[PDB]
Structures are given as structure tokens and as C-alpha cells.
């Protein structure tokens, strides 16, 4: 249970007090998964700023917001893409595979530039998972 | 208990939204609200490619409040619109009405999207929605009208409008 290579220094340091990790089941992993999601949020908000990131700012909050088009989004991780019904009418879902693939609604909104970063970021994290065979602890966390 | 033309998820979302058992026509009213909600979903599948509409109906209260702050917009908790067009910065309410002909707006803080039992759209609702969206609505309300006629529920439904 150490900060992985693929996670950013700032991300990990910011994540520490955002949720009380020791108390939870798969607490180190749950932190890492949430760190994937924040990383995704940052990757997406490198358009110009088009997106503001609300996750882990300084209670019922979205993960980012499009300043131009005035739309809120929530980043999700899913195991089955086809089986997906919106969780919210207001915070629109941006769902992805562990492999990196994005859902129909997700690919209509995001630019290739942002997807290719995320798929790059996700396989590198999936590699880290598979290195320590943490597959079921991650798949459970997605339920 | 649910009609097959209503989706399972919509049905289970409606469960807690109002105290149906206490009402006369309570089951029929639940179904009518599901129609309105189902219609909100059928409208919001469009995109500019960012989502065109946000749906407020049957959402958590604190989320409705959060976005209206960001969009510098304000509706009473009693009268909250069903969806919001992110393109035009204008809000709507899905109404079901028997008489479309001489329809008068319900509000001045949002607009009405009025529909028939046959699925026909009110003049002003027709102006707003694309043909793509009306086919889907009228097709859904045909399947809804079938269920109504199959269970001889036509009077109850007309009365509760």
C-alpha cells in the first residue's frame, strides 16, 4: 500500500484527507480508484479554460463543469458499457471501461485528444493493477 | 404491478416521489407522471456535442439547487421545471392535456410542452421540438394509449387531466 508510479504526486497528496481511507474496505485501492477519476478530470480540463474541476476543491458536487456550454459532468468507471442508464438528469455521466473505452454518450461529448489521453492513462493503471492482481478488489469497488 | 410500456427504472424512481396509495386514481396518476418523465428522457437524447437538455424532474433537491446557482437561475421548490435547454437558457414543463386547441401557458417562469393522449403536440410545443423527438413521443404514447384502452381506463385518465 504505497502511492503508485502512475499517480501524480499532487493528486495523491490531495487525496489523503478527502476520505478516511484506513476505515474503509479496500481503503488503499478506493483511494487509488478515486485518484484515477481525478486524473481523468484533469486530462479533460486541458482544453481552453473550457472545464473547471470541482472534485476535491477546498456537499453534493459534480466532478467538472463546462464553462462555455454550461453543463455539469460526473466521471464514472463501469465494467459493462452496453448496460448503462444515466445516474442523474443533471450531472451527466462520462463513463469509461478499465480498458479505456468510453460509452456512446461519452464519445459524443469528448474530443479524440481527451479520449486518447485517458485510454493511455487507464491501461498504464490497469497494468499496475494486474502487476499486483488487484482485479476483484477493483471490480468490487465499481459495484 | 408496473405496465410493460413503462421502463423498470422509471417505475422504481416513481415509487417514492409521492404518496400514491393515499390518492384515489393513485395508480393511474403514478402512470401519468411516469409518462411525463419518460418524455423528458426521450427529449434529452439530443446534443449541441454536449448535452442539450438537463432533466430536473424527480432529481435530488440539492443537485437542482447546485446547477441553478451556477446558471444564475431560480425556481420555487413548489414550481420547478421538468427540463432545461442548455442551448437557449430556457426551461420547460411536460404537461398532458386533453384540449390542445386553445391552450394557455401555465406559468411565466417556464414554458409548457403540452401533449395529447393520442400523442399530438400543442402548437407551441411543436415549434420547439424536432421531428425526431415527436415521433419517439407519439410512438410511446400509442403504446401507452393501448394499455389504457386494454384495461378500460379511458375515463379515469381523462378525469385526472
Numbering used by the authors:
A (entry chain F): 2 to 49, 55 to 64, 82 to 166
B (entry chain E): 3 to 50, 53 to 165
The paper states:
Despite very low sequence homologies, all domains have similar folds to those of the corresponding IAV polymerase domains. However, the critical active site residues in the putative cap binding and endonuclease domains are not conserved in THOV and DHOV and, contrary to the case of IAV polymerase, neither domain shows the expected in vitro biochemical activity.
THOV PA-Nter comprises four principle β-strands surrounded by six α-helices. Comparison of the two independent molecules in the asymmetric unit of crystal form 1 shows that the region 72–89, including helix α3 and the following loop, is in two very distinct orientations. Interestingly, this asymmetry is also observed in crystal form 2 of THOV PA-Nter in which there are six molecules in the asymmetric unit. These are arranged as three asymmetric dimers, each similar to that observed in form 1, but for the chain in which the 72–89 element is dissociated from the body of the protein, the electron density for the element is lacking, presumably due to mobility. Interestingly, the significant difference in thermal stability behaviour of the THOV and DHOV domains correlates with the enhanced plasticity and much poorer diffracting crystals of THOV PA-Nter.
